[PDB]
Amino acid sequence: KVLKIRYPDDGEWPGAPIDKDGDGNPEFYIEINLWNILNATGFAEMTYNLTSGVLHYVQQLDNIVLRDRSNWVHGYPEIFYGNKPWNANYATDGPIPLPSKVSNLTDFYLTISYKLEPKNGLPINFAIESWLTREAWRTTGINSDEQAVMIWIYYDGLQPAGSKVKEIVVPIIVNGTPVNATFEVWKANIGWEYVAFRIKTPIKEGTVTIPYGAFISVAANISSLPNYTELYLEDVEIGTEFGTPSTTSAHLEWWITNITLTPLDRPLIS
Ligand X SMILES: OC[C@H]1O[C@@H](O[C@H]2[C@H](O)[C@@H](O)[C@H](O)O[C@@H]2CO)[C@H](O)[C@@H](O)[C@@H]1O
Q: Binding site membership for Ca(2+): which residues?
A: 19, 21, 23, 25, 27, 83-84, 87, 89, 93, 249
Q: Which does 35 bind (CB under 5 to 8 A by kind): ligand X, Ca ion, none?
A: ligand X
Q: What angle do CA 41, 237, 203 make, to 5 degrees?
A: 85
What residues contact residue 221 under an 8 Å CB cut-off, 6+ apart?
none
Euclidean distance between CA atoms 175 and 53, whole angstroms: 19
Does position 247 bind ligand X by CB under 6 A? no
- Total Cβ atoms within 10 A of residue 84: 24
Contact footprint for Ca ion (CB under 5 A): 19, 21, 23, 25, 83-84, 89-90, 93, 139
Does position 86 bind ligand X by CB under 6 A? yes
Q: Which does 73 bind (CB under 5 to 8 A by kind): ligand X, Ca ion, none?
A: ligand X
Range 185-244, binding ligand X (CB under 6 A): 190, 241
Find the binder of ligand X among 28, 72, 108, 126 (CB under 6 A): 72
Euclidean distance between CA atoms 264 and 178, whole angstroms: 17
DSSP-based three-state secondary structure for 189 = strand
- How distant, in Å, are the alpha carbons of 151, 173, 174, 216, 262 from that of 210? 10, 7, 9, 12, 10
Find the binder of ligand X among 106, 159, 223, 248 (CB under 6 A): 159
**Positions that interact with ligand X (CB under 6 A):** 33, 35, 71-73, 76, 86-87, 150, 158-161, 190, 241
